[PDB]
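URGENT: need a sanity check before tomorrow's submission.

F., can you look over the Inner tegument protein record below? I want to be sure the sequence and structure line up before it goes out.
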Amino acid sequence: STVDFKKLIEQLRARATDKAEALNTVSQLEIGAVDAQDVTASAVRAFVGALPSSGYHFGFVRQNVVFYLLSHATVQTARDPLYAAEQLHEQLDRFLRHQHDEDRLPFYHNGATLTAFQKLLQTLREIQTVIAEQSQPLVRRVITQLETAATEARPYVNCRAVAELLDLTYQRLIYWACTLMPYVLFRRDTDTELDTVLLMHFFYTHYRSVNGDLAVEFQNYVKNSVRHMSSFVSSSPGAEHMRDVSYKLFVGNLQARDASGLMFPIISTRISTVNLYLSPERMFFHPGLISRLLSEEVSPRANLDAYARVCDRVLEDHLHTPRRVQRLLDLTQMVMRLVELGFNHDTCAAYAQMALIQPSSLFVSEIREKLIQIIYNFYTFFMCLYVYSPTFLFDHRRRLILEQHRSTLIGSKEELQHVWSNVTLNVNTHFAVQYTEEDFEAHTKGATEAEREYLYRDLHSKWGVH
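Structure tokens as predicted:
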């Protein structure tokens, strides 16, 4: 969809007599985009020369070509977008120096735009360096540095070049921070023997980068510390979801490949056994238990009050729309709160798929309804989180996920729309992404009516409604 910049320049000067057809030719660049690699110093000089001297926003593009090209240049189609943006800055810097020499729009001038762009690149390069080395604490300090850079780049946040870079860095920082879940931060002194087994297996399989010591901790703990293993082990519904952890417990090694054709006891999914040896707050670390509750394959005398109590606590603590705006540091805290309950992006997807399987007593049916609301609200949260950035790019992706209920679930359209009909989305989607009229009118001080029509048109093609 990206234009051939040089071909667009050739068509531009051949049609420079008709300002209308020259406006339609340059609109292919504004609607689509130009590759940042195609914006060389020589190409900028000819693009300005090919533009009509007056008419529509051609005067704005001529006077402020740096802002205009930055607002339509793309870097995401490059192997390294940050290095591509740096070279884009060099070409725009060569153009300004090799062609030196009105105060209408101060933020949109060439000198103000280019130095603000390099200011962003320097922060992003230092942030990219810190995250690459780590492949008050560093996590909070990089989050603060990025959000300050995004705040200072507010007048340019709608520029495709800086919007893509902020989008690239935010998603990269979010992905890195969501891996920093060490087991020792979530260990409770009240954790039982089954709690510890499921917790260690959870963090070693989902966060091995920061839990490399769990392999020897699990081996030492299982061999020398557990004493009630034969109680919560059996040799039943939901047992197929416990087979991997049951084998590693039976062998005493988290790194053991699934046997050589060996039979072993499975961690019990019996409700009365789980009521004794599992803390109710760790229920979502027990997939076999959640399996039985979702499928309602349970007897009338199984006591489920402890797990219904936990579901109510989760519903009251996390499932409502907050009043204030939730910024990047708030979203990171919520992940750690959800990880504490056993919810990450992967386990929410598996539980959301597990809940689609259709199943009796009303009290068992109510817990399934509570689980579905919890699982699908946190599933939606992790889908928006991994594509979050305070830019129009995330706003579009957010609408596709909420309005269309896009996901990766398996099933016919009938059972897919059936499970979403039994879900009321009140989860925190109040993510920080706002460019309002106060922001707009502050940056368009001396904008003429022809310049304002172009700016409104560019914002509409990126945001849609506002």
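My own read: DSSP finds 23 helices and two strands in the chain. The longest strand covers residues 34-35. If you see anything odd, call me.
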